Amino acid sequence: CQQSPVLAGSATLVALGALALYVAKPSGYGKHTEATRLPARAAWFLQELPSFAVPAGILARQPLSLFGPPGTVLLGLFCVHYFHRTFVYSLLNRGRPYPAILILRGTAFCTGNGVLQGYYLIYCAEYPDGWYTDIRFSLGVFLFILGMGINIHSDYILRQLRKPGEISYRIPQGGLFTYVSGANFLGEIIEWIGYALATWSLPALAFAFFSLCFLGLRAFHHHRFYLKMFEDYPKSRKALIPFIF
Ligand SMILES: CCCCCCCC/C=C\CCCCCCCC(=O)OC[C@H](O)CO
């Protein structure tokens, strides 16, 4: 198990997070983005696919027994998330046309990240014997399914705000959106923090930190957008963290 490529992957993954904050301006593929584009369903399909296929391939070489290592089962949860993100979320996506340029970078991210998380958990990660009863797992797994529930529940609420083909932004109403503008982001952030907690691993903590930086900035700009574009937007709402930010 080479420890040098691992520390480097977590470094870039963190440096990326820092870089996204330095630019301050959003990644520009949704709201603040206004023949160089392609359908968003195909875009997010291609972008997020590596973060599924690579861990799926890594898993496919391991024995089939749930009565086995914790690092494998956790990698399965990573695979379960990006299965939804690719084949369910992305293929049902109702977003505007996506910039072709960003796909290769988005794909590059999900490739390296998929390699990092998958390689570490199998070849590097080492867990004690009573991990499934440990508070880090029992809470970490809890936070994971909690955040995923929130992330998917909110992405669906957002999806039902449009008919396919529509170019429009309506005020997101419904569960947990009543408190924060970026409810789906809140969920995903909760999801990876718990994931880092359940794996107790450096590269997972890094990806969680990136997601916090990226989606946390994305949430803020979304919050800005609503306050800028809707005179009757609920002013009790916050950007990301309820009653705080
Ligand atoms: C020996 C342990 C010393 C450090 C104790 C820290 C306790 C957790 C405190 C804050 C993190 C909470 C939010 C993030 C969830 C935890 C994931 C994590 O940090 O795991 C990395 C692990 O420590 C790599 O050895």
Numbering used by the authors: 5 to 38, 44 to 254
Which lines from the publication concern this structure?
SRD5αs belong to a large group of eukaryotic membrane-embedded steroid reductases, which also include sterol reductases such as the 7-dehydrocholesterol reductase (DHCR7) that catalyzes the last step in cholesterol biosynthesis in humans. Although these steroid/sterol reductases share very little sequence similarity, they all use NADPH as the cofactor to reduce specific carbon-carbon double bonds in their steroid substrates. To our knowledge, the reported structure of human SRD5α2 with the dualsteric ligand NADP-DHF represents the first structure of eukaryotic membrane-embedded steroid reductase.
Human SRD5α2 was expressed in insect Sf9 cells and purified in the presence of finasteride and crystallized in lipidic mesophase with a space group of P622. The structure was determined to 2.8-Å resolution by molecular replacement based on a structural model from de novo prediction since we failed to use anomalous diffraction data to solve the structure. Unlike the bacterial sterol reductase MaSR121, the structure of SRD5α2 contains 7 TMs (TM1-7) connected by 6 loops (L1-6). In addition, the N-terminal residue C5N (superscripts indicate location of the residues hereafter) forms a disulfide bond with C133L4 in loop 4 (L4), suggesting an ER luminal location of the N-terminal side because of the reducing environment of the cytosol. The structure of SRD5α2 revealed a large cavity inside the 7-TM domain at the cytosolic side formed by all 7 TMs and L1, L3 and L5. The cavity is completely occluded from the cytosol with only one opening on the side of 7-TM domain between TM1 and TM4. Strikingly, after ligand fitting, the distance between the nicotinamide C-4 atom of NADPH and the C-2 atom of finasteride is shorter than 2Å, suggesting the formation of a covalent bond. It is likely that SRD5α2 took endogenous NADPH during recombinant protein expression to catalyze the reaction with finasteride supplemented in protein buffers to generate the NADP-DHF intermediate, which was stable enough to be captured in our SRD5α2 crystals. In our structure, both the C-3 carbonyl and the N-4 amine groups of DHF form hydrogen bonds with E57TM2.
